[PDB]
Design a protein around this ligand. Structure first.
Ligand SMILES: CCNC(=O)c1cc2c(N3CCOC[C@@H]3C)ccnc2[nH]1
Length: 154
C-alpha cells in the first residue's frame, strides 16, 4: 500500500533552492518541490509539473538520484518518494500558494527548519551519491526507525 510522490532539488554548484511550505502536511519547513504523482503522467512528468506549479520553473532535464519510503504511524499508505536533482532551471523562481522559494548556500542549509531525515540523506544528494532510504515516523518530529544506503541504480 504505497503512493507515488516526487521531490525535486534544484542544486547549482554553490547553492540549492528550497521552498518554505506554506500549507498542508509539513508546512513550516523548507522542502524541495514535489507532490503526488497523478493518473496519466510519468513520475518524471509529475516532478516537472509540481516544480512548475510550486516555483514557476521549468527545466531541461531531471536526474533521478534517490528513492525514499516514508511510513507514518497510523497511516495506511506508505509514501514512495522519487527524488530528482537538476541544474538546468529555466526561469526565475516565484512564490506560489504552496511554496515560498529561497536560495541557500550549501554551507547554510537550514536543517533545523527541515524534516529531520534530511540531515541523513540530503548530504548524500549533495555529495552526488544515489541513495535508497526508509524512515518510519511518529508524527512529524520523531524518527522511530530508518535504513539508508547508497546505490548504483535508483
Ligand atoms: C531536502 C528537502 N527535503 C524535503 O523536501 C522533504 C520532504 C519530506 C517529507 N514530506 C512528507 C509530506 O509530503 C511532503 C514530503 C514528501 C517527509 C520527510 N522528509 C522530507 N523531506
Amino acid at each position: 500500500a504505497s503512493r507515488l510522490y516526487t521531490l525535486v532539488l534544484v542544486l547549482q554548484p554553490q547553492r540549492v533552492l528550497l521552498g518554505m511550505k506554506k500549507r498542508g502536511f509539513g508546512a513550516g519547513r523548507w522542502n524541495g518541490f514535489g507532490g503526488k504523482v497523478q493518473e496519466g503522467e510519468t513520475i518524471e512528468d509529475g516532478a516537472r509539473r509540481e516544480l512548475q506549479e510550486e516555483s514557476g520553473l521549468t527545466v531541461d532535464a531531471l536526474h533521478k538520484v534517490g528513492q525514499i519510503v516514508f511510513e507514518f504511524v497510523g497511516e495506511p499508505e506508505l509514501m514512495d518518494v522519487h527524488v530528482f536533482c537538476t541544474d538546468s532551471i529555466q526561469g526565475t523562481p516565484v512564490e506560489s500558494d504552496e511554496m515560498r522559494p529561497c536560495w541557500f548556500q550549501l554551507d547554510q542549509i537550514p536543517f533545523k527548519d527541515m524534516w529531520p531525515d534530511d540531515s541523513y540523506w540530503f548530504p548524500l544528494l549533495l555529495q552526488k551519491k544515489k541513495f535508497h532510504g526508509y524512515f518510519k515516523f511518529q508524527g512529524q518530529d520523531t524518527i522511530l526507525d530508518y535504513t539508508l544506503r547508497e546505490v548504483d541504480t535508483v
